[PDB]
Design a protein around this nucleic acid. Structure first.
Lengths: 203, 8, 202, 31, 105, 101
RNA sequence: AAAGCUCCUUCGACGAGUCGAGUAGUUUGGGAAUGCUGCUCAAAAUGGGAGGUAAAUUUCUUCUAAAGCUAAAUACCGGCCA
RNA sequence: AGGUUGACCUCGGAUCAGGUAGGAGGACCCGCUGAACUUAAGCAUAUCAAUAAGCGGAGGAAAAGAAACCAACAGGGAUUGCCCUAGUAACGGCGAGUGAAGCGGCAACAGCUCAAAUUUGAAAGCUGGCUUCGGCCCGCGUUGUAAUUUGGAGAGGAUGCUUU
């Protein structure tokens, strides 16, 4: 099973420039950090759940926060990209839990944010006071605001007094019954409509 | 009357 | 606005008024030259929605192109290799007559930049298009931030590279599963799939 | 044939308002 | 020119602390421009509509008699888009309209 | 919204979450008819008239050959749904004309 | 003078020989589900597209085409410097 | 004077005033067009290959790009690139063979502009010429140049604080 029937030698890509590219990327990262000092080098990202039944067990970082999250955190959508927060207009909040988690994330970021004034002579009420501007800072939001619990805890202790009773009939019986009900949802409804029609015809 | 939008 | 009424009127191309106007305009454009300047667009709503403005530096050029298929220029129209099971009468050009018209109009006015183009009329022999062109050297164009992107040298001859609307349509630059081979560039994707990657610590 | 500096730096009125009232701020995050 | 003296007079008024409405009166002019006249007809503000007979392309004004008949606007087709342009200080005017005139007229 | 059963299979399968009600996105307003759009389309319709295939479907519906009109509309347009909608609006046109007359 | 936030009775325009259909050529893993082009027909207003087996009926989920701009990570047997 | 005097529209002329294009290079990039040797026992499907040759067009990158997307989940969320998916799904005479994509981890991240609205209590917009550098003219333009709006919304209201 070797696919060497075309002119493969014309487009062989060797990777001897891997350490040179790593050095170039590190130089670009340090230049970006020096240009963006004292701000962090990257934007804040929300915690989103991976799609599909294979990966829904694990959460990760998303593209940006939703407008509902920004509104509930009290951050205007025009101020948000100017203070290092990423905004994603396509994403929606279909449940309360992710909305509350991202709102709490934005609230912690807002509480830990230090906002320098536009002019040093005239500080506004929304800006950080000069005596409070001096504090230890972080430059990696991916590390400081990372995914602390990507997976649920797979090990938990309960007492035997509070053990669950269990579903009646058994879990395997419950799964078989659910599958059979899903496969027979339509036929039972049609027979119910037929019985209702017979009752209406000959009540 | 047909109005395109509300007018100030 | 009247352009909404012009839009809904131009949707009904088989009504009596639109058929009469299309017939008389077909006769006039067939009597005129193959490529000629239009003083004003014949479809102002279509030109305006495609990006035309009534500003110095915007011009309209009308063009007719012979319609039908493409014939391979071999002597006596016969191929002398392996049999192809088909004739040259059923070969199809992979780009549009609109794109061919855009290239011919650009070669007629090489100092301008082709913005977009639109169908105006057709008959059995020709299809008729009107092409909007922008002057990259006009001060009114260069001072407008909505259009001075076309003054950059990267936008030279968009119609020759397929950067116009019909060019993107022919290149299949659409998102989705139906455009897997062509959404990022067909030959680039083919090279990416057929290249062999050999890392150092393999 | 390159565009002049002022023509390249021209912005629209809406963009001018957005840059006037919401520019890129200087900020820091506590650790 | 008349706009220049009007703006100069309004500038003097706002310099000595009066509103522009205190020194300037409500204007009464012939309404023109195709989109403007179509909007006035749709809002039933135009009292009279004059449409040029030689508009090329004809689709710009081919619906205007029917629009005026639906909205109950008195309309008339007249000869000369250049003749209307002489009214509106232009070379060409496809359609003009009167919404209101003065009490003397 | 209906509550999920919390099982991996069956009806209403999936992990239990508190579903939200959300304000309708303005991108989903497309297809809703506007007052100005209705007025403009009605005026353009009475100015321009009908297409020849539309007149053919009109006379077929006047004769009462509904299946033949549906087949001709499908042949002219391409899809059964577009044919059905075209036949419905032409029947509405016939009804409006007969209620006018 | 412009600008943002909060709430709302109401309004809320959104790209046509275009989408789509048939047919022919070509292409594709998409010779049952691909894209492009030519010819013929040719749309609509909660409409339209998609949901990889053809069709009718009833639903559901996603977006919003036929106008346009935009750095970076990517490529480099040409040129220059090392 | 009315057989006159003009206003527009369209089409021309000028060694008119001011500009622009051609050719080179083409390693990489965007398209068009397009083989055969080879591999299939031979050989018109196929493979080579949507390659070589030929043609048009750019730049330091080009192209693509902010969903008429993926999905079917507790939902992800512009484009590009690497690893993986995976030699898998799938396609294929008489079989030699061909062959993706979603998710996932990473690199890098950046968002937006028009048409469809009447400024109508005032084309507020712009090219060119002359300048005493204050401006003044010839004009373009209402068959629509400015401000505002782009679906993430917005328009109209109500409300009380903030911003330049």
């Amino acid at each position: 099973n070797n696919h060497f029937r075309k002119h493969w030698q014309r487009r062989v890509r060797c990777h001897f420039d891997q350490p040179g590219k790593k050095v170039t990327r590190r130089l670009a990262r340090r230049a970006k950090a020096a240009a963006l000092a004292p701000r962090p080098v990257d934007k804040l990202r929300p915690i989103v759940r991976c799609p599909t039944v294979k990966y829904n067990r694990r959460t990760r970082l998303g593209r940006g926060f939703t407008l509902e999250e920004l509104k509930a955190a009290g951050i205007p959508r025009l101020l948000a990209p100017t203070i290092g927060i990423a905004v994603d207009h396509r994403r929606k909040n279909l449940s309360e839990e992710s909305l509350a988690a991202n709102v709490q994330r934005l609230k912690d970021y807002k509480a830990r944010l230090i906002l320098f004034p536009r002019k040093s002579n005239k500080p506004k009420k929304a800006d950080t006071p000069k005596d409070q501007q001096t504090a230890e800072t972080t430059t990696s939001l991916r590390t400081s605001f990372g995914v602390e619990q990507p997976l649920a805890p797979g090990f938990t202790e309960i007492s035997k007094s509070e053990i669950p009773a269990g579903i009646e009939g058994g879990a395997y019986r419950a799964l078989r019954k659910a599958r059979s009900d899903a496969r027979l949802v339509g036929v039972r409804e049609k027979r119910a409509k037929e019985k209702a029609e017979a009752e209406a015809n000959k009540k | 009357a047909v109005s395109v939008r509300k007018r100030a | 606005g009247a352009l909404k009424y012009l839009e809904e009127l131009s949707k009904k191309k088989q009504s009596d008024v639109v058929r009469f106007l299309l017939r008389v305009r077909c006769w006039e454009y067939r009597q005129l030259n193959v490529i000629h300047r239009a003083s004003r667009p014949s479809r102002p709503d279509k030109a305006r929605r495609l990006g035309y403005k009534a500003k110095q530096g915007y011009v309209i050029y009308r063009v007719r192109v012979r319609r039908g298929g493409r014939k391979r220029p071999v002597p006596k129209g016969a191929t002398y290799g392996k049999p192809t099971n088909q004739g040259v009468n059923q070969l199809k050009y992979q780009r549009s007559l609109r794109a061919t018209a855009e290239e011919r109009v650009g070669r007629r006015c090489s100092n301008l930049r082709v913005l977009n183009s639109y169908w105006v009329n057709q008959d059995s022999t020709y299809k008729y298009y009107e092409v909007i062109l922008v002057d990259p050297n006009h001060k009114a164009i260069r001072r407008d931030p909505r259009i001075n992107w076309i003054c950059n040298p990267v936008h030279k001859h968009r119609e020759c590279r397929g950067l116009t609307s019909t060019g993107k349509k022919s290149r299949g630059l659409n998102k989705g599963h139906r455009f897997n081979k062509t959404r990022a560039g067909r030959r680039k994707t083919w090279k990416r799939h057929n290249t062999l990657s050999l890392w150092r610590y393999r | 044939r390159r565009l002049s500096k002022e023509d390249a730096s021209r912005v629209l009125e809406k963009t001018k308002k957005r840059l006037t009232h919401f520019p890129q701020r200087k900020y820091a995050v506590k650790a | 020119q008349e706009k220049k003296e009007r703006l100069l007079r309004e500038a003097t008024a706002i310099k000595e602390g009066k509103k522009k409405e205190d020194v300037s009166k409500k204007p009464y002019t012939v309404k023109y421009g195709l989109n403007h006249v179509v909007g006035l007809i749709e809002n039933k503000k135009a009292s009279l509509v004059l449409i040029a007979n030689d508009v090329d392309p004809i689709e710009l004004v081919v619906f205007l008699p029917a629009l005026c008949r639906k909205m109950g606007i008195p309309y008339a087709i007249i000869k000369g888009k250049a003749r209307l342009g002489t009214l509106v200080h232009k070379k060409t005017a496809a359609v003009v309209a009167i919404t209101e005139v003065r009490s003397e007229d | 919204p209906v509550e999920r059963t919390g099982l991996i299979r069956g009806l209403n399968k999936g992990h239990k979450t508190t579903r939200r009600v959300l304000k309708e996105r303005p991108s989903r307003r497309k297809g809703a008819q506007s007052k100005r759009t209705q007025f403009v389309r009605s005026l353009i319709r009475e100015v321009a008239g009908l297409a020849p295939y539309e007149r053919r479907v009109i006379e077929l519906l006047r004769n009462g050959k509904d299946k033949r009109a549906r087949k001709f509309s499908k042949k002219k347009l391409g899809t059964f749904g577009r044919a059905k909608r075209k036949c419905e609006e032409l029947q509405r046109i016939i009804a409006e004309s007969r209620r006018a007359h």
